[PDB]
């Protein structure tokens, strides 16, 4: 059985979230929470909350033992981009993509 959590439209660039996700994918949920806690990246606390949300869903909704959980899927999808403009020299503007992420974790029993 599986339990999912998603954080949609989090204001972090997908590429940066994926760096941290690649550390935890496949791991036992206890080990994953430790990695996130000790990984000094902006994505770490965000991903941690999605992981803990998925674990809570596993316990509460599906009646799954939290100590037996593994991260079975973990991925970051692109959310909608906030388009901004930075004034450059010579009266030119250059686009700034303030990108967002959809962060999915699926936990399953080992």
């Amino acid at each position: 059985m599986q339990a999912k959590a998603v954080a949609r439209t989090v204001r972090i660039a997908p590429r940066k979230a994926r760096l941290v996700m690649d550390l935890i994918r496949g791991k036992q949920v206890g080990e994953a929470v430790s990695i996130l806690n000790l990984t000094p990246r902006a994505a770490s606390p965000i991903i941690e909350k999605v992981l803990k949300s998925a674990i809570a869903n596993a316990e509460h909704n599906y009646e799954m033992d939290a100590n037996n959980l593994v991260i079975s899927q973990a991925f970051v999808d692109e959310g909608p981009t906030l388009k901004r403009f930075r004034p450059r020299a010579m009266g030119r503007a250059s686009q700034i993509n303030k990108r967002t992420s959809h962060i999915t974790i699926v936990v399953s029993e080992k």
Binding site: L19, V20, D22, L23, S34, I35, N37, L38, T39, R41
Partner: protein
């Protein structure tokens, strides 16, 4: 100097082989059992080398 050709998906991916985080240099805390960075005080319980800091 500008890109003469766009970079393919493949070449971009090949370049990012090494653009990767390492797993933290972590060990189990002998006091409380949470993972800590080796040679650092445990953030959870505040212990280091069997002494409360």
């Amino acid at each position: 100097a500008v890109p003469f050709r766009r970079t393919s998906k493949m070449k971009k991916r090949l370049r990012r082989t090494h653009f990767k985080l390492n797993v933290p240099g972590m060990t189990e805390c002998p006091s409380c059992g949470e993972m800590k960075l080796s040679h650092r005080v445990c953030k959870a319980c505040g212990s280091y080398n069997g002494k409360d800091i």
